[PDB]
A paper describes a structure:
Especially, exposure or modification of N-terminal amino acid residues can mediate protein degradation and the resultant proteolytic procedure is called the N-degron pathway (formerly the N-end rule pathway). Two tertiary degrons, Asn and Gln, are hydrolyzed into the secondary degron Asp and Glu by N-terminal asparagine amidohydrolase 1 (NTAN1) and N-terminal glutamine amidohydrolase 1 (NTAQ1), respectively. In multicellular eukaryotes, Nt-Asn and Nt-Gln are deamidated by NTAN1-encoded NtN-amidase and NTAQ1-encoded NtQ-amidase, respectively. In this study, the crystal structure of NTAN1, the last veiled structure among three amidases in the N-degron pathway, was elucidated.
Although yNta1, NTAQ1, and NTAN1 do appear to share catalytic functions commonly involving a conserved Cys residue critical for the deamidation activity, they exhibit low sequence similarity to each other.
Residue numbers in the entry: 2 to 306
Write the structure that this text describes.
C-alpha cells in the first residue's frame, strides 16, 4: 500500500488534500517548485520519453542521471529503493496505468540487497488543472494502482495537477514540466534537457503511432536497447504535415494552450519520420535485433554492433 508519514493513505483523495494534510509532502512540494530549472547536459544522462521506463542503480558506470521533460498533462514517476539505490524513472501519460505501475514495481523489485537497508520511495510530478481532467484522472489512477500493491511504498514527492498549476491571463499550465534524478546522490530536481537522443524521432514516432510503455535500458550490460518496433501507416500523415501550427496544437495536443514552445516543431519532425517510415519493422532493424547504444568515454551515446 501507499504510505505517508508511515500510515496508509485514504483513497480517493485529491493530491492537494493529501499534501495539505501532511507537512513533509507540503515542504517537499514548496522546495521543488521553488527551484530554478537546471539545464542538464548529456554527460551520464539517460533521457526518458513519454511512455518509456528506465531503471538502473548506483553501480552503473555509464548512467548517473535519469530525466524527462514536457510533462503537460502527463506525470513523471520515480520509484527508488533507498537501500540498494535502484531507481526507475517513468513518464506516464494515462495510456494504461493499471499495466504500467506493475512494470515500474517489477523493475525495482528484481534488485536484491533490499532487506537490510532502506525502503521503497515514490515521487510523482507533472500535470496541471487542465479543462479535460486528464491530469487529475492520471493522478487518481497512479495513486490507486500503487496503493493496491502488497509492498509498502512511501510517498515522498507529490507535485501533480492542482499542486503543479499556475495561471496567466486566465490560462492554466504546469509549473514543473521536467525533472532529473541523480542516481548516486538520490537528488530529484527541476530540469530541462536539450540533448534527448539517441533515436529521438524513432522513439517519438513509436509512441505517436500508439505503442505501449516499454523499458529502454539494460542496466546489466549498460546498453540502451531501441526496438525493433512496428506500426501501420499513420493516418493522414501528409495532411497533418500541411496544417499550420494552430491546427496542429488544437488537434494533436491534449492541452493546446499549455504545451511548451517547441511542441509543434517536435511533432512535425515525428510526423515526417512516420511519413518516411510507414513500416519500420523490416526496414530499420535487421533480423529482429535491437539498436544498441552505449555511453562512450566522454559520456555521450554511441551506436554499437
Amino acid at each position: 500500500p501507499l504510505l505517508v508519514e508511515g500510515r496508509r493513505v485514504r483513497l480517493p483523495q485529491s493530491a492537494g488534500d493529501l499534501v495539505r494534510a501532511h507537512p513533509p509532502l507540503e515542504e517537499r512540494a514548496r522546495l521543488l517548485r521553488g527551484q530554478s530549472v537546471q539545464q542538464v547536459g548529456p554527460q551520464g544522462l539517460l533521457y526518458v520519453q513519454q511512455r518509456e521506463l528506465a531503471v538502473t542503480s548506483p553501480k552503473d558506470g555509464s548512467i548517473s542521471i535519469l530525466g524527462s521533460d514536457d510533462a503537460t498533462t502527463s506525470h513523471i514517476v520515480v520509484l527508488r529503493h533507498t537501500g540498494n539505490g535502484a531507481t526507475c524513472l517513468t513518464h506516464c501519460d494515462g495510456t494504461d496505468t493499471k499495466a504500467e505501475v506493475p512494470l515500474i514495481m517489477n523493475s525495482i523489485k528484481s534488485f536484491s540487497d533490499h532487506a537490510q537497508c532502506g525502503r521503497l520511495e515514490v515521487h510523482l510530478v507533472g500535470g496541471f488543472s487542465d479543462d479535460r481532467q486528464l491530469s487529475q484522472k492520471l493522478t487518481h489512477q497512479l495513486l490507486s494502482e500503487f496503493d493496491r500493491q502488497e509492498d509498502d511504498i512511501h510517498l515522498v514527492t507529490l507535485c501533480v495537477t492542482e499542486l503543479n498549476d499556475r495561471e496567466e491571463n486566465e490560462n492554466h499550465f504546469p509549473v514543473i514540466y521536467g525533472i532529473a534524478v541523480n542516481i548516486k546522490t538520490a537528488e530529484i530536481y527541476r530540469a530541462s534537457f536539450q540533448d534527448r537522443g539517441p533515436e529521438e524521432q524513432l522513439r517519438a514516432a513509436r509512441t505517436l503511432a500508439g505503442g505501449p510503455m516499454i523499458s529502454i535500458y539494460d542496466a546489466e550490460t549498460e546498453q540502451l536497447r531501441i526496438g525493433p518496433y512496428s506500426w501501420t501507416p499513420f493516418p493522414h500523415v501528409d495532411f497533418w504535415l500541411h496544417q499550420d501550427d494552430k491546427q496542429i496544437l488544437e488537434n494533436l495536443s491534449t492541452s493546446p494552450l499549455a504545451e511548451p514552445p517547441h511542441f509543434v516543431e517536435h511533432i512535425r519532425s515525428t510526423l515526417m519520420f512516420l511519413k518516411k517510415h510507414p513500416s519500420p519493422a523490416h526496414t530499420l532493424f535487421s533480423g529482429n535485433k535491437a539498436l544498441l547504444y552505449k555511453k562512450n568515454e566522454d559520456g555521450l551515446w554511441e551506436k554499437i554492433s
